[PDB]
Write a protein that binds this ligand. Structure first.
Ligand SMILES: [Mg+2]
Length: 229
C-alpha cells in the first residue's frame, strides 16, 4: 500500500500513520499524521471528491501531535513502495487550523496549494511524472514551506494523483496524507483556501486525462491556483 510512513521537518524525523499496523490496534502510537481506515484499495477516486474522505483520506481523524517547521525550510515526505504504472502529479497544500490542529473539524479546513509537480517529460507516453521523480529519489518528495507564510498551526496535505486509469470517468485515484504542523518564523502571507470537498471535479482536465496518447498538449495540474506572493 502506497502511503507516507514519515516526514522530516527542521531536520527531525516524525513517524507517520502506519496503515499496515496501526489500524489493527486499540491504541496505536501518537503521531502528527492523521489516522485513516484506508486499508483496502488505498485511494479516494472521483466518486469521493465531494465526500469527507477526500480531505485527509478515508475516515480520517486528527493526529494528536504537531511538528514544528520554520517557514522557508524543507519538509521531506517518505513514501512506501509506489507502483511504476501509477504515473501522476504530486500536490501539497496547507490549511490553517486557526486553533489546535488536534481538535479542528476537518470539514472546515480550507487548503492553499503550496507546491505542485506534474508531467516532467511527455515525449514518450505515458511519460515521466512527479511520482517517477519521487521513486528515483529513494521514494521521497520534498517541498519548501513558503518563507513569507504566516506563523501558525496548519494541516499539511500531501497527495499523489495516479492517472493510469484516468481516461475513465472517476478513474483518477487520489492518495492524500495529512500531518499537523506548526510553522514558525515566517511572514504575514496566507493564500485564499479551498474546502477539501471543493478541490477536484471528476470532469477537470487534469483529472479525466489520457496519459497514453500524445502528450503535446501538456498536463494541467488540477486543484486551485498555486500560492506565490
Ligand atoms: Mg481504502
Amino acid at each position: 500500500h502506497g502511503f507516507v510512513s514519515g516526514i522530516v521537518a527542521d531536520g527531525k524525523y516524525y513517524g507517520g500513520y502506519l496503515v499496515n499496523q496501526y489500524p489493527y490496534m486499540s491504541n496505536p502510537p501518537d503521531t502528527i499524521a492523521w489516522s485513516t481506515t484506508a486499508t483496502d484499495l488505498g485511494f479516494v477516486d472521483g466518486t469521493g471528491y465531494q465526500s469527507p474522505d477526500i480531505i485527509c483520506h478515508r475516515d480520517a481523524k486528527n493526529g494528536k501531535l504537531t511538528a514544528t517547521v520554520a517557514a522557508g525550510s524543507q519538509i521531506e515526505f517518505q513514501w512506501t513502495t509506489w507502483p511504476e504504472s501509477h504515473h501522476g502529479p504530486l500536490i501539497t497544500y496547507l490549511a490553517p487550523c486557526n486553533g489546535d490542529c488536534a481538535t479542528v473539524d476537518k470539514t472546515t479546513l480550507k487548503f492553499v496549494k503550496i507546491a505542485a509537480q506534474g508531467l516532467i517529460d511527455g515525449s514518450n507516453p505515458p511519460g515521466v511524472w512527479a511520482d517517477d521523480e519521487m521513486i528515483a529519489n529513494n521514494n521521497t518528495a520534498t517541498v519548501t514551506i513558503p518563507a513569507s507564510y504566516a506563523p501558525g498551526n496548519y494541516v499539511l496535505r500531501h497527495e499523489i494523483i495516479a492517472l493510469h486509469s484516468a481516461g475513465n470517468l472517476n478513474g483518477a485515484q487520489n492518495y492524500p496524507q495529512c500531518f499537523n504542523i506548526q510553522i514558525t518564523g515566517g511572514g504575514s502571507a496566507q493564500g485564499s483556501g479551498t474546502a477539501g470537498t471543493s478541490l477536484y471535479k471528476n470532469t477537470d482536465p487534469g483529472i479525466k486525462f489520457d496519459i497514453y496518447s500524445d502528450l503535446s498538449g501538456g498536463y494541467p495540474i488540477p486543484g486551485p491556483a498555486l500560492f506565490n506572493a
